[PDB]
Amino acid sequence: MVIGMKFTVITDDGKKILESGAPRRIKDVLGELEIPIETVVVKKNGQIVIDEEEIFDGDIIEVIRVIYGG
Structure with a gap:
């Protein structure tokens, strides 16, 4: 109907809020x-x-991302 996905990626930076007009795959973003x-x-x-x-x-x-991972 209306395309536009808003999701949150949580990392060391915290919860990051970003929305993309086109529903895409994990690999894209x-x-x-x-x-x-x-x-x-x-x-x-x-x-x-x-x-x-x-x-x-x-x-x-x-x-x-894992600590002591490298």
Whole structure:
């Protein structure tokens, strides 16, 4: 109907609020900021997901980069 998704990504910076007019995939936004999934853990509302999943309006992306991970 109306396209426009607002979601929150939580990291060390805290909960980051950003909304995108086009409903995109994790990899899209992740790739644009290029956040290395190689060293950080991606969670959807708690569940560990890959960068192949899509983002939704009201979805919570918990990006938890691991301490002593390197």
